[PDB]
């Protein structure tokens, strides 16, 4: 079971039991995160699109095929957007017979040939024109429709035909916020999933105050964001990832200490030192006088305490000089062997 | 002193043999003999020490301790007698050489 | 003359460099579990081997160290080389009067390989530096063994060894005489007055 | 010192080159396509890196 | 000796990685597709190896 702080290192490296030495560790966590969106100024205009499907059953055979199925977009056969924002759904009507007899039949969309997905169109995806339709037209991909009885036998019923063309004018929205004049959002102080001037990623956004004039985006030399700037003012913001890797030391099937970069306690360890370029977290004493592991400029001993490394003692006497004094000349000799 | 060679996995393994001092000895050194204040003698080779213990003069090396007796074939003439020399007259030169 | 004796150790992280902390890569890198398990150890083995050799030559002597003072060098003004004694800290000896002029030239322009501190790359409140910009990609630079102090204890123990003649326990011959013994090696000096 | 600097400056600069995929940022790949289609794209970057 | 062993252990382990093809074994490729279509797949492994 992957529950204990040490039981996770094995669970991460896919190994039953570990050797002695230093190991790298960075435990991620899957969760749900809020979403922020900042874009260049533009006005707001919205539209809504449904996608309904009603059915009836019971002709001669049930588990074979449904009797009839209807597909329509907003009641029409083709509807598309002259506006700047849109959002699409999918609705299956189960109150056709009053009593919900549709409990047995499952109907859902499949994955077609388009280079996107129906369920992820509401995200901040950008196009030029779309013009959905429910009839065949040349040059258009499609999403098939499926019907099944308790997941025994599958069949194809209909399809949804969609066109597009690359552009930067029409953007999808998760849901129609009403009463606003410029769609924007910003969540600070803990991890989010930002979409800022066509940049996507994760991190924490904090405020600051620096005196800089020029661009509205400071990227690194590897394509990642480091800080942007609100255009209607002078304040800037800072973006940093919220998961930093560490270094763990393993000795005799247990964790001795770690060298983190965050000023807090760690994976079962309590005490906290402060080295010149990082922090050290352990739970040992300070009375050890031995060494079992070695690192750049210090040696971690058995219980976790730090011990500095010492140089080697060696004494020598220089060459003799012509002088009227007292000298020292070797008298007896011994041998030794080196390899 | 010498060395020994033995083989190993795709290589060689040497076995050196060196010496190491254990005990030292204290010596009352000198720097040369100046006779009659003007004529002076010094040792030609720069690896010899002229010393004297309790009245007798001997010559040894500087790396090991191998005393022996001095001979006239080890001295050159270094005239004008630096001050920190041994004061001795020519009539008694045979007591050191 | 200048010689190079060591380089800087680099330790990299596989899962962070391959993708920036996405919790979905790790489900795909499991099929490559031996692809980068052989990289971290391949780097850390050489990084460990370097220190076992660099620290094996940097010895230290105590008696010869005490003779490195400027008062025991005759009339040869060598005071711009000897290490500085007191720094008002817990350091036996610091940089010399000449090393500072060397470090004022180049090492201040490296900006990405020397004495970086990782305690500040995790607080924000400013645009990230160049050194902290790489730490977000898993590249970490370990500290070296030869710091400012050990190099001032190994060099000072060699500069002070010249005046240490073959006298008794701790006597020091004048430096005007340490050259008379190094000139007789060439030819026997036959001049009474120097 | 210049040679030491250039080696890391070259290593950190190869994350910009997207291989034969949609984009060079994985959060964008997992934001557009579903789970069954993004696995054929992510490995194209993984093998290059 | 460890360094000598690791070099061959790394070389013999790169036959597992299938490139942008169907599988990492050529017999499987020729067992599924016809002759006119497997030639655009085999070369993707040949160039990598
Ligand atoms: C092409 O377009 C480019 C984009 O616009 C353009 O680059 C930009 O050039 C402008 C020049 O005006 C940069 O402006 C900044 O201005 C700051 C404000 O102070 C100055 O500007 C005021 C308005 O002009 C003046 O009034 C002001 O005088 C007043 O204030 C004085 C001080 O208080 C006072 O004494 C006076 O009496 C008066 O009251 C002043 O003149 C300024 O702070 C800022 O400083 C830069 O330079 C300093 C010295 O080098 C640095 O200390 C500082 O950190 C800034 O340098 C950074 O940027 C440099 C260039 O990129 C780098 O070389 C530096 O190393 C440093 O880079 C670090 O920091 C970056 C973030 O800032 C980071 O991204 C790096 O990775 C690195 O870590 C600066 O002068 C504007 O900043 C420039 N744009 C960018 C992005 O840098 C370019 O010039 C155009 N090309 C051509 C040919 O024209
Ligand atoms: C960028 O943002 C950051 C944060 O995001 C800003 O940092 C903060 O800046 C605030 C000021 O804008 C700081 O507020 C200080 O508050 C002190 C009192 O707080 C105590 O008491 C409260 C309860 O009342 C308590 O909650 C709190 O915790 C504290 O215990 C004030 O005393 C202080 O003012 C003092 O200093 C100013 C001028 O400061 C000068 O010197 C600074 C270095 O010491 C230097 O950094 C400054 O730039 C400046 O040169 C002075 O005016 C004050 O009073 C003087 O004048 C009166 C006459 O009016 C005179 O009678 C008196 O004798 C003094 O001569 C006083 O001495 C602050 O207001 C806050 O602490 C900061 N936060 C942090 C974490 O540092 C930052 O300012 C922003 N800007 C920049 C450019 O970075
Ligand atoms: C990494 O994180 C660690 C934390 O895990 C940091 O360690 C602490 O760092 C602090 C600052 O460097 C150390 O000082 C303490 O600061 C506390 C907060 O004060 C700051 O913040 C407030 C705003 O919240 C601000 O207004 C203020 O100006 C400061 O900036 C203080 O509360 C704390 O006081 C503690 O001690 C006093 C009594 O101390 C006196 O008496 C001692 C003998 O008893 C004597 O030895 C001391 O020297 C001193 O003379 C105590 O009264 C405080 O409150 C207790 O008592 C009241 C009732 O009396 C009770 O209500 C309350 O709950 C407490 O029980 C308090 O205990 C310090 O001044 C702090 O010491 C560090 N902690 C440790 C364990 O070392 C570290 O700094 C971080 N690293 C970096 C780089 O940032
Ligand atoms: C080269 O080598 C040769 C031989 O190999 C050296 O010759 C010998 O040099 C020795 C000097 O170290 C001589 O020993 C001294 O003997 C003195 C007595 O001699 C008198 O009596 C004899 C007859 O017995 C007579 O022939 C002679 O002419 C004299 O009249 C001692 O007094 C003297 O002791 C002195 O030093 C000790 C040192 O004690 C501690 O203190 C030091 C700090 O000051 C410390 O650093 C040391 O390490 C040490 O631990 C001191 O305690 C003595 O103090 C006594 O006297 C004071 C009054 O002055 C009194 O108050 C106190 O209570 C003590 O009672 C005293 O100052 C030496 O032991 C030896 O005789 C010589 N032998 C020959 C054959 O020549 C030559 O010196 C070497 N040259 C060089 C340059 O190294
Ligand atoms: C998916 O979509 C389809 C397509 O729309 C949909 O099918 C419609 O279903 C609705 C549901 O009720 C039907 O609505 C009814 O329409 C009646 C009018 O029917 C006309 O056509 C009759 C013949 O059509 C059948 O036969 C031909 C072959 O000949 C076949 O191809 C057809 O597919 C179909 O099976 C015809 O007999 C009928 O004539 C009547 O009316 C005239 C006067 O106009 C009279 O003189 C005749 O004697 C006869 O009575 C007519 O021409 C309509 O009458 C009916 O009325 C209901 O409501 C009133 C109240 O207003 C009640 O009083 C009455 O009793 C009825 O309950 C009702 O409106 C519609 O006709 C279907 N469409 C077609 C083309 O047939 C599916 O339902 C959709 N799926 C789901 C799950 O809903
Ligand atoms: C930092 O670390 C060091 C070392 O790691 C540490 O030193 C330890 O300190 C603790 C506590 O002070 C010591 O534990 C105590 O030991 C007491 C006895 O130790 C002395 O006596 C030893 C022999 O005694 C036995 O034999 C005689 C007969 O000969 C018999 O009468 C006695 O009853 C007893 O059976 C002696 O060997 C030992 O010497 C050690 O050190 C020297 C070098 O200095 C070395 O040469 C020796 O070989 C040996 O290693 C020492 O002189 C003991 O009485 C005492 O018992 C208390 O606790 C028990 C419960 O456990 C109670 O029941 C009892 O009533 C007492 O209250 C306790 O066990 C420990 O021995 C030290 N370790 C060493 C190696 O010296 C420091 O304390 C640490 N901290 C600091 C700040 O420095
Ligand atoms: C090469 O060799 C030289 C040899 O000279 C060496 O230089 C010496 O280095 C040592 C370092 O150990 C220096 O020793 C220091 O002495 C400090 C004392 O001097 C200060 O204090 C004087 C007053 O103290 C008197 O009164 C107190 C009681 O209040 C009493 O205890 C004292 O013993 C003493 O009697 C003060 O007069 C003096 O000022 C002099 O100099 C100024 C100019 O700077 C001049 O204007 C004055 O008129 C006066 O002449 C000076 O201010 C001492 O503080 C220091 O440390 C001690 O104190 C700390 C606590 O603070 C303790 O923790 C520590 O253990 C010490 O006890 C230290 O001992 C010595 O002064 C140097 N001498 C010279 C001439 O420079 C070089 O370093 C060598 N080089 C190398 C590379 O090794
Ligand atoms: C099984 O029964 C169904 C209906 O009971 C037959 O098919 C439908 O019959 C209705 C009669 O009201 C027509 O309105 C539909 O148009 C018919 N559907 C189709 C697709 O033709 C069917 O013929 C019977 N036999 C089978 C399925 O073998």
Nutshell version of this structure?
It is classed as viral protein. Chain A is mainly beta.
Task: Explain the overall architecture.
The structure is cut from a larger assembly and holds five copies of chain A. Chain A is an all-beta fold and 339 residues long. In chain A, 3% of the residues lie in helices and 33% in strands. Chain A contains one helix and 26 strands. Chain A has one helix at residues 5-13, and strands at residues 21-25, 35-38, 48-49, 52-56, 68-72, 85-88, 91-92, 105-109, 126-129, 141-149, 154-162, 165-172, 193-196, 204-207, 217-219, 225-228, 237-240, 246-250, 255-258, 271-272, 281-282, 298-300, 306-308, 312-313, 326-330, 333-338. A five-stranded antiparallel beta sheet of chain A has the order 1-18-19-21-20, with no helix packed on it. Chain A has a four-stranded mixed beta sheet with strand order 3-6-12-9, with no helix packed on it. Chain A has a three-stranded mixed beta sheet with strand order 5-4-7, with no helix packed on it. Chains in contact: A-B, A-C, A-D, B-C, C-D, C-E, D-E. At the A-C interface, strand 1, strand 24 and strand 25 of A face helix 1, helix 3, strand 2 and helix 6 of C. Strand 25 (326-330) of chain A pairs antiparallel with strand 3 of chain B. The site of a molecule of 8 linked components (NAG-NAG-BMA-MAN-MAN-MAN-MAN-MAN) has 6 residues of chain A, from loops. Chain C: It is found in: Virion membrane; Host endoplasmic reticulum-Golgi intermediate compartment membrane.
């Amino acid at each position: 079971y992957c529950d204990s702080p040490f039981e996770k290192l094995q669970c991460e490296h896919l190994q039953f039991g570990l050797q002695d030495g230093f190991y790298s560790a960075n435990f991620l966590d899957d969760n749900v995160l809020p979403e922020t969106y900042v874009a260049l100024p533009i006005y707001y205009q919205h539209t809504d699109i449904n996608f309904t499907a009603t059915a009836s059953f019971g002709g001669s055979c049930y588990v074979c095929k449904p009797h009839q199925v209807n597909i329509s977009l907003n009641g029409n056969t083709s509807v598309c957007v002259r506006t700047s924002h849109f959002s699409i759904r999918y609705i299956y009507n189960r109150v056709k017979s009053g009593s919900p007899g549709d409990s047995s039949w499952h109907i859902y969309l499949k994955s077609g040939t388009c280079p996107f997905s129906f369920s992820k169109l509401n995200n901040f995806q950008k196009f030029k024109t779309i013009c959905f339709s429910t009839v065949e037209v040349p040059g258009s991909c499609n999403f098939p429709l499926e019907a099944t009885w308790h997941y025994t036998s599958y069949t194809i019923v209909g399809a949804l035909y969609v066109t597009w063309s690359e552009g930067n004018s029409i953007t999808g929205v998760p849901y129609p916020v009403s009463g606003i004049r410029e769609f924007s959002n910003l969540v600070l102080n803990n991890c989010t999933k930002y979409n800022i001037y066509d940049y996507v990623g994760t991190g924490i956004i904090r405020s600051s105050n620096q005196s800089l004039a020029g661009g509205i985006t400071y990227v690194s030399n590897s394509g990642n964001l480091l800080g942007f700037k609100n255009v209607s003012t002078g304040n800037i913001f800072i973006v940093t990832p919220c998961n930093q890797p560490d270094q763990v030391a393993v000795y005799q099937q247990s964790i001795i200490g770690a060298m983190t970069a965050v000023n807090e306690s760690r994976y079962g360890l309590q005490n906290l030192l402060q080295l010149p370029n990082f922090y050290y977290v352990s739970n040992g004493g300070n009375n050890c006088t031995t060494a079992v592991m070695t690192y750049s400029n210090f040696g971690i001993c058995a219980d976790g305490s730090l011990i500095p490394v010492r140089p080697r003692n060696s004494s020598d006497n220089g060459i003799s000089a012509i002088i009227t004094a007292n000298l020292s000349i070797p008298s007896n000799w011994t041998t030794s062997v080196q390899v | 002193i010498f060395s020994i060679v033995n083989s190993a996995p795709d290589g060689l393994l040497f076995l050196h043999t060196v010496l190491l001092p254990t005990d030292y000895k204290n010596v009352k050194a000198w720097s040369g003999i100046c006779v009659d204040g003007i004529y002076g003698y010094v040792l030609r080779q720069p690896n010899l020490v002229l010393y004297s213990d309790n009245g007798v003069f001997r010559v040894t090396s500087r790396v090991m301790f191998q005393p022996r007796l001095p001979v006239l074939s080890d001295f050159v003439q270094i005239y004008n007698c630096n001050v920190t020399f041994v004061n001795i007259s020519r009539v008694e030169l045979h007591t050191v050489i | 003359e200048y010689l190079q004796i060591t380089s800087t150790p680099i330790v990299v992280d596989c899962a962070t460099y391959v993708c920036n902390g996405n919790p979905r890569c790790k489900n795909l890198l499991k099929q490559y579990t031996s692809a980068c398990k052989t990289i971290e150890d391949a780097l850390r083995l050489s990084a460990h081997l370097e220190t076992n050799d660099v620290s094996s030559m940097l010895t230290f002597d105590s008696n010869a160290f005490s003779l490195a003072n400027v008062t025991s060098f005759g009339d040869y003004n060598l005071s711009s080389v000897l290490p500085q004694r007191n720094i008002r800290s817990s350091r036996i000896a610091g940089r010399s009067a000449l090393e500072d002029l060397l470090f004022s030239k180049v090492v201040t322009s490296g900006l990405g390989t020397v004495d970086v501190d990782y305690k500040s790359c995790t607080k924000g409140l400013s645009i990230a530096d160049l050194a902290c910009a790489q730490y977000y990609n898993g590249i970490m630079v370990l500290p070296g063994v030869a710091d400012a102090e050990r190099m001032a204890m190994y060099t000072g123990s060699l500069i002070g060894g010249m005046v240490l003649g073959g006298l008794t326990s701790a006597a020091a011959i004048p430096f005007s005489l340490a050259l008379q013994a190094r000139l007789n090696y060439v030819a026997l000096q036959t001049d009474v007055l120097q | 010192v210049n040679q030491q600097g250039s080696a890391l400056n070259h290593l950190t600069s190869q994350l910009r080159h997207n291989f034969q995929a949609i984009s060079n940022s994985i959060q964008a790949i997992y934001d557009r396509l579903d789970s069954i289609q993004a696995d054929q794209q992510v490995d194209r970057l993984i093998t290059g890196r």
